[PDB]
Design a binder for these strands. Structure first.
Length: 1326
RNA sequence: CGUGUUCUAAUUGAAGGUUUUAGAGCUAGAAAUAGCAAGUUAAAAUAAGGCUAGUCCGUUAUCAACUUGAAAAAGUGGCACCGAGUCGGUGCUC
DNA sequence: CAATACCTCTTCAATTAGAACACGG
DNA sequence: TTTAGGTATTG
């Protein structure tokens, strides 16, 4: 006789229970435990809060990291295992010192000095070769045998930090001189293209190409010197290509299909080559000439140093950085001595202040130290060039800085190679292992290979040819690499909804194509002059149509049918076709795709070869990497010409279908012995449809399927709640709410509800890049003209201006950067139709009156001027298809009366699909009973509501919701949603299809919805009491019921249950604190004394436990008795459970009482004394446990007082509210007294409270809007949970935390329900 | 069907940061002190660590209590009424 | 004791897959 | 992107 309404949010879940007259019931419960009480009475409405659920994204980037960090450790491992024999010969302990290089001299086992043991020599190496990049030049240059331990020393370093694989190819650093290389291209292109010459013109190609200027520009700067060549003309692309780019010369050679080329991209050498043959072999020389330049320029940025001396340029730049520090370090210090020597300690000796002494020795970034000395360099004189260097960002470079990592790995490998080549003569073992050693630097598992697991990884999927250990060297052979690649993908791709078991067919499969075609053809009707009835296409006719027309054309069209087949074959001079649009919707595209590739039409037609064409496409869809693609294209390799095969690889396919293969031809109807495809070709008689067939009872197809949906019988609840497409947090809630219902029903005597009413409610650097790119494609200097910062664009009217590129969207005029305030944000589509605050639906222009009518999308006039302008933006990606299409809409007829009706509806019916399964799951769990007909006995209605019913209802009925005041409102919001949705479908059963779960003309529809919520009101002239005119049933009573709502709303006691959740996650703050004399510090590794070595700190605690036990005090070690809290940290927790006592004793608690220990999750609740209540938060601290049941009038009063966004109300009413603000303006004192009395009673943090009071007291003069909003601020001290910062108008009130758990220890412990209804109460004295 | 954004799940890379150690500091001066020279680099751990010993796994999800289960998860607590500062009383069942 | 006041690893690359959602045709 | 438990500091 009751109904349950619930609110499901990210962090909260609101529930309620309602009588037959919208009252809320009031039951007396039991209370297990030792306390005197044996029952308590509580209301039937409330909310269960919790911590927001957390996504796996951080955890995965950890998952990734750990797999990542160790592999790098492994590379440093293979060098040693290569080296071990020859290193012991040379040195016994070199490797041992390195492993133990970290340990303290006292704990050091071998000689402290890693490289040579001796103190004297190590000093020597460090001063001939002071930075490891001074050593890296030597052994790529020197032709004199060198100490092996220096050689390994070089090698690991490159391997440990190796360079990025963004670019894959081979680099011959014979490319140092760009000018020479470029000029050589001018030559070979002239020879190729005698007719139109190029003249070199003495461009500082090295100078032009070399420069930092943006990549697109340089090719422009180069073509600005040429005498009159087009940018995109053949030369231009080539030039553009060497510089990293993906130009296109398809337009100069008019290839039918676009021919795009990246040197960097893996698919280049063939790609040009696959292309190159197609333009003649002659050019091929031209591109290589281009690559050779690319190599010389490509590396240009790492070193501008003359190539000619050095075969190891990259390392050389670092030596250069070192020198350019030194003299600028002498000259700075020297200059400071020359001027302002007095302030010289701060700059160098003192770490704290960002001084150079800070820079080397303190936590001072390169950007933190450059902006410290900025005044000083400027203040100083004789420093002028120095200034220039810094502005360049070159002032005092360090060898490791954030940027490196635009160093490709192929010079780090360029330099590994030089060393081996250099010294393999001295040492035979290198030539034996040069390949291995290079392979260590070279080798990266691909993504599709996955973790090299052996059956123990939830994550990994690879499969093994040989079970021997995998080493970079043996890799291809051990891993079933291709097969593994098909495994990568076949776990993230779909299964048929109809058939769970069969994995979905790829999109470009011929069979889907013979299915789509034969299906769209099944319902073609045709008529001619002679016939009585227009009739279906016959089986003979369809096959004839598919074979002739479709197999001959990509697209088959209506008059292709009329004249090509009927006239040619059936000779109907003229015909009428009912079935189709201008052309058939499907096409036999894949059939056509192939015909071009292999040119054997009968082959495609032949049935026997048909499983090849699906295992061609399943392999062509399935794979990304062209080398990978080849492997399974060998299996069918024998038949085709070699020339085709090369062609075959290129046309890769994408996307996947929804239909399987046993469907389309998989299953056979028993009586008719035909599969759907069979059915589709030749069904009739009548030509049945896929949909039809799947519901033809006469047919077995529905029946057979029936088993398929059933198999596995669904899955248990979280197994299902964790597969719904949505927020991780939202799913957590979805679960929690059902755990509420099964109680609320359990509570209501296991009596199922009449109605269950559900609601759900609804970047800093992202803005920077999108603009960054957009201007670049646009090429405007507007970004240059005015620059801005990454922290600035959370303000739209600023941010919008940039996407619009400083021009009026509706006006074609430039914009005032400074006075954005005068201008107006305009939402393209009016808010009344839809509520959109997105960058997608907003625009900024001076006046929002130039778009057009208030009541429509931007006017035809607006589109005409700037439709074109809107294209530059879309291409720039400065706007979007959603943003664009609406903007251009008006020429689409804009918003029809049909459109408007649609928006007004969607405000009220929830179409959000995440809120659907949730609705569905309730119905399924709730209604299990089955009637004699297959039909379902729906005994609980489910209802989904949009927020706007309830949110508006408070606005129009004096039920205002103030979020800040109490955590209660989340619970009122079920109640309202309960009675709203119950009373709705008691007046309009017709809407039950829309509002409840289970199976032009618009203008009126607009009316039907807009006024739907009228009936509650007395005047809009409505009768007080509502009814169903059909059933003669009462639904509403304006007088009695409204009063009831107020009675429910202001109820003093609501159930508010912070979920007790055990803490999880990282053990402690990731930061590694320096060695300290503290027992707080945690030893980073099991041997490493943090007093000695440093450690972590700040461990989080998965749950605390009360030990009532004894410890010894004093020399006597007398055993006293304690009862304290011991938090068990998350490192510790695993250890605890194996045995607590042994673990507990270890801490030193003695004669621990085994039975007494009680696990306490974070957020546990104790009520001590006055009814002041507290939630555990950490072992040492507790949280505000109390809620404020503010009498409503104060709740109502404030909402108006804050006066949010001024007033949105209808004008006459606004007068009505205001007097009451100041009739009851004295209420403000009432509120403070309410906080003031309560704060004294429960919050119990007086030291602050006087402080708070005073702020209000001296601000009595200030207006209510000011004072009024702020009192709302002041609620923050009050609120359930943990202290945070807050202020009155300018006065900031710091928090007061609760610093020990002692006061809990002889107090009541409350273990409540998932609802707060059932409790068990524990008086802690013992 | 086409397209596009957004968000989620997985995999495989790069660059910094941090932490002890190694880069013979000197000149005075009994000393705290005070004069100047030096600084740019490397090694190593990078969740403690687990057994299934992999170039594997190690921060998501799920969690009142009590009886019971390995775990999953099943089982446990009268009703009415009048009233309201976090549930208080009444009558009834019991 | 419990009042104040500081601290909290970061920023980039590449590849697949699928909902969900909103424009067009 | 800011909270809200851990840390040692000062009165």
């Amino acid at each position: 006789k009751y109904s349950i309404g619930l609110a499901i949010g990210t962090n909260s879940v609101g529930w309620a229970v309602i009588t037959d007259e919208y009252k809320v019931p009031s039951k007396k419960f039991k209370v297990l435990g030792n306390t005197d009480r044996h029952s308590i009475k509580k209301n039937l409405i409330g909310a269960l809060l919790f911590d927001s659920g957390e996504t796996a994204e951080a955890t995965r980037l950890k998952r990734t990291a750990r797999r990542r960090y160790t592999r790098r450790k492994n590379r440093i491992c293979y060098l040693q295992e290569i080296f071990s024999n020859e290193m012991a010969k040379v040195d016994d302990s070199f490797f041992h010192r390195l492993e133990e290089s970290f340990l303290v001299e006292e704990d050091k086992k071998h000689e402290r000095h890693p490289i040579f043991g001796n103190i004297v020599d190590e000093v020597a190496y460090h001063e001939k070769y002071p930075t490891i990049y001074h050593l890296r030049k030597k052994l790529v240059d020197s032709t004199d045998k060198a100490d092996l331990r220096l050689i390994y020393l070089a090698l690991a370093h490159m391997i440990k930090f190796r360079g990025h694989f963004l670019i894959e190819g081979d680099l011959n650093p014979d490319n140092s001189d760009v000018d020479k290389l470029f000029i050589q291209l001018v030559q070979t292109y002239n020879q190729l293209f005698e007719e139109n010459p190029i003249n070199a013109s003495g461009v500082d190609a090295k100078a032009i190409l070399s420069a930092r200027l943006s990549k697109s520009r340089r090719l422009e700067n180069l073509i600005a010197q040429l005498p009159g060549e087009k940018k995109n003309g053949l030369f231009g692309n080539l030039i553009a290509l060497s510089l990293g780019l993906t130009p296109n010369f398809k337009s100069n050679f008019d290839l039918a299909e676009d021919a795009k080329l990246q040197l960097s991209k893996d698919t280049y050498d063939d790609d040009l080559d696959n292309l190159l043959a197609q333009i003649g072999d002659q050019y091929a020389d031209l591109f290589l000439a281009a690559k050779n330049l690319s190599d010389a320029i490509l590396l240009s940025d790492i070193l501008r140093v003359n190539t000619e001396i050095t075969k190891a340029p990259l390392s050389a730049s670092m030596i250069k950085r070192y020198d350019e520090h030194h003299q600028d370090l002498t000259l700075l210090k020297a200059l400071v001595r020359q001027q302002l020597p007095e302030k010289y300690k701060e700059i160098f000796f003192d770490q704290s202040k960002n001084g150079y002494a800070g820079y080397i020795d303190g936590g001072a970034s390169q950007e933190e130290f450059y902006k410290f000395i900025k005044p000083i360099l400027e203040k100083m004189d004789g420093t002028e060039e120095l200034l220039v260097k810094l502005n360049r960002e070159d002032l005092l470079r360090k060898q490791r800085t954030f940027d490196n990592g635009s160093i490709p790995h192929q010079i780090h490998l360029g330099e590994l190679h030089a060393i081996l080549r250099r010294q393999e003569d001295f040492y035979p073992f290198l030539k034996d292992n040069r390949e291995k050693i290079e392979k260590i630097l070279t080798f990266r598992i691909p993504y599709y290979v996955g973790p090299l697991a052996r059956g123990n990884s939830r994550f990994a999927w690879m499969t093994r040819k040989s079970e021997e250990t995998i080493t970079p060297w043996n890799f291809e052979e051990v891993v079933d690499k291709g097969a593994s690649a098909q495994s990568f993908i076949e776990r993230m791709t779909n299964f048929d909804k109809n058939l769970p078991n069969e994995k979905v067919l790829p999109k470009h499969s011929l069979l889907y194509e013979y299915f789509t075609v034969y299906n769209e053809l099944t319902k073609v009707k045709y008529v001619t002059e002679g016939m009585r009835k227009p009739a279906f296409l016959s089986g003979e006719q369809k096959k004839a149509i598919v074979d002739l027309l479709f197999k001959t054309n990509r697209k088959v069209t209506v008059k292709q049918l009329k004249e090509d087949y009927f006239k040619k074959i059936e000779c109907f001079d003229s015909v009428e076709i009912s079935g189709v649009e201008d052309r058939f919707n499907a096409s036999l595209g894949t059939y056509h795709d192939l015909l071009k590739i292999i040119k054997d039409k009968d082959f495609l037609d032949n049935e026997e070869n048909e499983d090849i064409l699906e295992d061609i496409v399943l392999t062509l869809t399935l794979f990304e990497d062209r080398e990978m693609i080849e492997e399974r294209l060998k299996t069918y390799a024998h038949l085709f010409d070699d020339k085709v095969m090369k062609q075959l690889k290129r046309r890769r396919y994408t996307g996947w279908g929804r239909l399987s293969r046993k469907l389309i031809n998989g299953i056979r109807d028993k009586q008719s012995g035909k599969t759907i495809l069979d059915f589709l070709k030749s069904d009739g008689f009548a030509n049945r449809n896929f949909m039809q067939l799947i519901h033809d009872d006469s047919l077995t197809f529905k029946e057979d399927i029936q088993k398929a949906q059933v198999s596995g019988q669904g899955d248990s609840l979280h197994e299902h709640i964790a597969n719904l497409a949505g927020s991780p947090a939202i799913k957590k809630g979805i679960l929690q709410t059902v755990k509420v219902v099964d109680e609320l029903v359990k509570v209501m005597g296991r009596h199922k509800p009449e109605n269950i009413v559900i609601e759900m409610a609804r970047n800093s650097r992202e803005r920077m890049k999108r603009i960054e790119e957009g201007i670049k494609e646009l090429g405007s200097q507007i970004l240059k003209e005015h620059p801005v910062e990454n922290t600035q664009l959370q303000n739209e009217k600023l941010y919008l201006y940039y996407l619009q590129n400083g021009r009026d969207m509706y006006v074609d005029q430039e914009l005032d950067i400074n006075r954005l305030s005068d201008y107006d944000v305009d939402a393209i589509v009016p808010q009344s139709f839809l509520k959109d605050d997105s960058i997608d639906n907003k625009v900024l222009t001076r006046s929002d009156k130039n778009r057009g009518k208030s009541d429509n999308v931007p006017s035809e006039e607006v589109v005409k001027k700037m439709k074109n302008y809107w294209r530059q933006l879309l291409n720039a990606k400065l706007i979007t298809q959603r943003k664009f299409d609406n903007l251009t809409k008006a020429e689409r007829g804009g918003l029809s009366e049909l459109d408007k009706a649609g928006f007004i509806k969607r405000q009220l019916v929830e179409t959000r699909q995440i809120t659907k399964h949730v609705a569905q799951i309730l119905d399924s769990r709730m209604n299990t009973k089955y009637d004699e007909n297959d039909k379902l006995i729906r005994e609980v209605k489910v209802i989904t509501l949009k927020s706007k019913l309830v949110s508006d209802f408070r606005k129009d009925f004096q039920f205002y919701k103030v979020r800040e005041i109490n955590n209660y409102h989340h619970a009122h919001d079920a109640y309202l949603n309960a009675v709203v949705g119950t009373a709705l479908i008691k007046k309009y059963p017709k809407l039950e299809s829309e509002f409840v779960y289970g199976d032009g003309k618009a203008t009126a529809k607009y009316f039907f919805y807009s006024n739907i919520m009228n009936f509650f009101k007395t005047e809009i002239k409505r009768p007080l009491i509502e009814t169903n005119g059909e059933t003669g049933e009462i639904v509403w009573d304006k007088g009695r019921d409204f009063a009831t709502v107020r009675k429910v709303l202001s109820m003093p006691q609501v159930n508010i249950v912070k979920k007790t959740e055990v803490q999880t996650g990282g053990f402690s703050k990731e930061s590694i604190l320096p060695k300290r004399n503290s027992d707080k510090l945690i030893a980073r590794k099991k041997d490493w004394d943090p007093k000695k070595y440093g450690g972590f700190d700040s461990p989080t605690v998965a749950y605390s436990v009360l030990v009532v036990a004894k410890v010894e005090k004093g020399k006597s070690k007398k055993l006293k008795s304690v009862k304290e809290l011991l938090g068990i940290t998350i490192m510790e927790r695993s250890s605890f459970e194996k045995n607590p006592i042994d673990f507990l004793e270890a801490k030193g608690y003695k004669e621990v009482k085994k039975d007494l220990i009680i696990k306490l999750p974070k957020y546990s609740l104790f009520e001590l004394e006055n009814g002041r209540k507290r939630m555990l938060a950490s072992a040492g601290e507790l949280q505000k446990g109390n809620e404020l049941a503010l009498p409503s009038k104060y709740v109502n009063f404030l909402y108006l007082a804050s006066h949010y966004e001024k007033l949105k109300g209808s004008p006459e009413d606004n007068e009505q509210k205001q007097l009451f603000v100041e009739q009851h303006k004295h209420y403000l004192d009432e509120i403070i007294e309410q906080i003031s009395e309560f704060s004294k009673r429960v919050i119990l943090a007086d030291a602050n409270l006087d402080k708070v009071l005073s702020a209000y007291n001296k601000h009595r003069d200030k207006p209510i809007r000011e004072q009024a909003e702020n009192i709302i601020h002041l609620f923050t001290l009050t609120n359930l949970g943990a202290p945070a910062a807050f202020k009155y108008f300018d006065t900031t009130i710091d928090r007061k935390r609760y610093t020990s758990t002692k006061e809990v220890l002889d107090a009541t412990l409350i273990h409540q329900s998932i609802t707060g209804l059932y409790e068990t109460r524990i008086d802690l004295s013992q």
